[PDB]
């Protein structure tokens, strides 16, 4: 039971780290958004042969 305690704690810590990535928000990619205003992904075309 004591071991189970250790492990269980690790799993809870991982889980809350997961929720952590779920809670942050990142600055918008306006570039891609403006390209999609004009309905293409200008990036993926120019770049690609």
């Amino acid at each position: 039971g004591q071991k189970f305690c250790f492990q269980n704690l690790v799993h809870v810590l991982q889980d809350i780290r997961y929720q952590l990535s779920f809670a942050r928000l990142r600055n918008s990619d306006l570039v891609t958004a403006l390209d999609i205003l004009s309905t293409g992904t200008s990036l993926r075309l120019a770049n690609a042969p």
Binding site: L34, D35, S42, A46
Partner: protein, 31 residues
């Protein structure tokens, strides 16, 4: 509010395609 802003992908950076297009739009070149 919402005001229209004008931006035209100025961040992002051929005649063979032109030729092919004109080839389909007026057929032969010679004419």
């Amino acid at each position: 509010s919402l005001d229209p802003e004008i931006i035209g992908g100025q961040n992002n950076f051929n005649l063979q395609q032109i030729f092919q297009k004109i080839i389909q739009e007026r057929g032969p070149f010679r004419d």
